[PDB]
Design an enzyme around this catalytic site. Structure first.
Site, PDB file in Angstrom:
ATOM      1  N   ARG A 101      -6.209  83.190  19.121  1.00 14.29           N
ATOM      2  CA  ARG A 101      -5.253  83.982  19.895  1.00 14.29           C
ATOM      3  C   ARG A 101      -3.934  83.292  20.168  1.00 14.29           C
ATOM      4  O   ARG A 101      -3.231  83.735  21.063  1.00 14.29           O
ATOM      5  CB  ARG A 101      -5.774  84.518  21.202  1.00 14.29           C
ATOM      6  CG  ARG A 101      -6.667  85.741  21.137  1.00 14.29           C
ATOM      7  CD  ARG A 101      -7.127  86.014  22.565  1.00 14.29           C
ATOM      8  NE  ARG A 101      -7.635  84.790  23.190  1.00 14.29           N
ATOM      9  CZ  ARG A 101      -7.900  84.652  24.481  1.00 14.29           C
ATOM     10  NH1 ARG A 101      -7.714  85.638  25.339  1.00 14.29           N
ATOM     11  NH2 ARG A 101      -8.364  83.495  24.934  1.00 14.29           N
ATOM     12  N   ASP A 155     -14.651  77.121  19.318  1.00 13.60           N
ATOM     13  CA  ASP A 155     -15.722  78.024  18.819  1.00 13.60           C
ATOM     14  C   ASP A 155     -15.704  78.338  17.291  1.00 13.60           C
ATOM     15  O   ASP A 155     -14.975  79.173  16.762  1.00 13.60           O
ATOM     16  CB  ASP A 155     -16.140  79.234  19.723  1.00 13.60           C
ATOM     17  CG  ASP A 155     -16.372  78.999  21.218  1.00 13.60           C
ATOM     18  OD1 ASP A 155     -15.273  78.921  21.916  1.00 13.60           O
ATOM     19  OD2 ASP A 155     -17.448  79.068  21.771  1.00 13.60           O
ATOM     20  N   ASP A 196     -13.008  74.568  24.597  1.00 16.48           N
ATOM     21  CA  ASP A 196     -13.937  74.055  23.597  1.00 16.48           C
ATOM     22  C   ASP A 196     -13.656  74.684  22.271  1.00 16.48           C
ATOM     23  O   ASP A 196     -12.920  75.649  22.258  1.00 16.48           O
ATOM     24  CB  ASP A 196     -15.408  74.224  23.970  1.00 16.48           C
ATOM     25  CG  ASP A 196     -15.734  75.582  24.491  1.00 16.48           C
ATOM     26  OD1 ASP A 196     -14.993  76.223  25.236  1.00 16.48           O
ATOM     27  OD2 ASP A 196     -16.905  76.007  24.056  1.00 16.48           O
ATOM     28  N   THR A 214     -22.666  69.930  40.037  1.00 14.88           N
ATOM     29  CA  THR A 214     -22.688  71.039  39.156  1.00 14.88           C
ATOM     30  C   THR A 214     -21.765  70.919  37.942  1.00 14.88           C
ATOM     31  O   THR A 214     -22.074  71.442  36.864  1.00 14.88           O
ATOM     32  CB  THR A 214     -22.500  72.298  39.953  1.00 14.88           C
ATOM     33  OG1 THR A 214     -23.741  72.949  40.001  1.00 14.88           O
ATOM     34  CG2 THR A 214     -21.451  73.142  39.283  1.00 14.88           C
ATOM     35  N   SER A 221      -9.209  81.221  22.213  1.00 12.01           N
ATOM     36  CA  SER A 221      -7.780  81.256  22.439  1.00 12.01           C
ATOM     37  C   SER A 221      -7.039  80.651  21.299  1.00 12.01           C
ATOM     38  O   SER A 221      -5.880  80.955  20.958  1.00 12.01           O
ATOM     39  CB  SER A 221      -7.443  80.742  23.799  1.00 12.01           C
ATOM     40  OG  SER A 221      -8.573  80.018  24.226  1.00 12.01           O
ATOM     41  N   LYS A 225     -16.574  89.637  59.074  1.00  9.89           N
ATOM     42  CA  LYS A 225     -15.894  88.493  58.562  1.00  9.89           C
ATOM     43  C   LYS A 225     -14.463  88.818  58.296  1.00  9.89           C
ATOM     44  O   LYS A 225     -13.584  88.027  58.554  1.00  9.89           O
ATOM     45  CB  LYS A 225     -16.579  87.836  57.405  1.00  9.89           C
ATOM     46  CG  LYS A 225     -17.398  86.669  57.875  1.00  9.89           C
ATOM     47  CD  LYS A 225     -18.663  86.491  57.043  1.00  9.89           C
ATOM     48  CE  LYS A 225     -19.702  87.574  57.279  1.00  9.89           C
ATOM     49  NZ  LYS A 225     -21.078  87.050  57.374  1.00  9.89           N
TER      50      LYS A 225
HETATM   51 CR   LIG Z   1     -15.173  78.226  23.890  1.00  5.61          CR
HETATM   52 NA    NA Z   2     -22.610  72.471  34.899  1.00  2.73          NA
END
Ligand SMILES: [Cr+3]
Ligand code: NA
Ligand SMILES: Nc1ncnc2c1ncn2[C@H]1C[C@H](O)[C@@H](COP(=O)(O)OP(=O)(O)OP(=O)(O)O)O1
Ligand code: NA
Length: 327
Positions: free
Chosen positions: A175, A184, A182, A93, A172, A64
């Site tokens: 940070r 946390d 999201d 997905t 973050s 490849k």
């Molecule tokens: Cr998170």
């Molecule tokens: Na997903």
DNA sequence: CATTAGA
DNA sequence: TCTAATG
């Protein structure tokens, strides 16, 4: 890093594709160690054979590589990229809730688009239901400006229920990070440690509070230690409402907050780097503690932590502000 | 790599 | 129970 780039990325795409569209973990595995090793390779790969000499580099991959080096593309690559079926699994997905497995089935039944998902909400489970509902807001970044607002709220109710609650928004956001994906929030309480046979309610009480006041709007999954939901900042005085956001609150045995905290603070590298360090410095660090290392190869015994500090100290390092934990 | 849903 | 999905 850039000299081996194209190769790596093609490979990773390759790898990826197997792992989802197809159920080929092995190939998938193939593509990775390869993509792994070729990455470290100190020189410009110049042909397959060259590549080939490498451990993990098979005859297949090499083939490849040539075609990619020789022609700025790859067939199996263009063909995948094109392939509506594969395109669909890759897409579906995205829904929080959806994974490869279910992605393939949805297709198999014909749900390729978001809409199909809509008409067939029946076919989806509560998580994915919420996944589908906040599809848009789920993809959005979180402006730190809001982080401050949420963070702000969360702290109040926490303290408001029981003053003993300690709580940190890691990630973050801790940070510095201009934005975050999201929120946390790490959590613990004195009355909950290593031994002290839990206190579920501990988690539960707060979850209740935050909801009470309408911070938390959706529950993706609540357990006795790990809550996973949806929240949203009050929409002021009409005209501007808030995007629904992902949030995870985790209960912790106060006797291992620090590490945990340290840990979730990141970055990926800082951790690692910090982790590698404690090793020379005769230790071991992981998601929940720090243990003194024994020459017999290994050894136990959990050191005592009071703050991000103790840990720093232990390995005799220089306290790194979160802001600078970037690497 | 561990914690939850679900079936 | 195991098997998926999140982190
Ligand atoms: Cr998170
Ligand atoms: Na997903
Ligand atoms: C591991 C990586 C991080 O240090 C920590 C988990 O953070 P993670 O869930 O990845 O935050 P994140 O990247 O998802 O969100 P954020 O947007 O808050 O940075 O544990
Ligand atoms: Na080889």
């Amino acid at each position: 890093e850039t000299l081996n780039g194209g190769i790596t990325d093609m490979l990773t795409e390759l790898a990826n594709f197997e792992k989802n569209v197809s159920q080929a973990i092995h190939k998938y595995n193939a593509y990775r160690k390869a993509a792994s090793v070729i990455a470290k390779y100190p020189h410009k790969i110049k042909s397959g054979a060259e590549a080939k000499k490498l451990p993990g580099v098979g005859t297949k991959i090499a083939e490849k590589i040539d075609e990619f080096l020789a022609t700025g593309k790859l067939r199996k690559l263009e063909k995948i990229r094109q392939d509506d079926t594969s395109s669909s699994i890759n897409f579906l997905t995205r829904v929080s809730g959806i994974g490869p497995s279910a992605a393939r089935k949805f297709v198999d039944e014909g749900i390729k688009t978001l809409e199909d998902l809509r008409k067939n909400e029946d076919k989806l489970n509560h998580h994915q239901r919420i996944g589908l509902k906040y599809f848009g807001d789920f993809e959005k970044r979180i402006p730190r400006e809001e982080m401050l607002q949420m963070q702000d709220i969360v702290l109040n109710e926490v303290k408001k229920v029981d003053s003993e609650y300690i709580a940190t928004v890691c990630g973050s956001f801790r940070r510095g990070a201009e934005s975050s994906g999201d929120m946390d929030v790490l959590l613990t309480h004195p009355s909950f440690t290593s031994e002290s046979t839990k206190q579920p309610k501990l988690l539960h009480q707060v979850v209740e509070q935050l909801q009470k006041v309408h911070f938390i709007t959706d529950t993706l999954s609540k357990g006795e230690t790990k809550f996973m939901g949806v929240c949203q900042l009050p929409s002021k005085n009409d005209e501007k409402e808030y995007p629904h956001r992902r949030i995870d609150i985790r209960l912790i045995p106060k006797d291992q907050y620090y590490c945990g905290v340290l840990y979730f603070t990141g970055s990926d590298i800082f951790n690692k780097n910090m982790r590698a360090h404690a090793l020379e410095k005769g230790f071991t660090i992981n998601e929940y503690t720090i243990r003194p290392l024994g020459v017999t190869g290994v050894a136990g015994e959990p050191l005592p932590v009071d703050s991000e500090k103790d840990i720093f100290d232990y390995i005799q390092w220089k306290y790194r502000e979160p802001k600078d934990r970037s690497e």
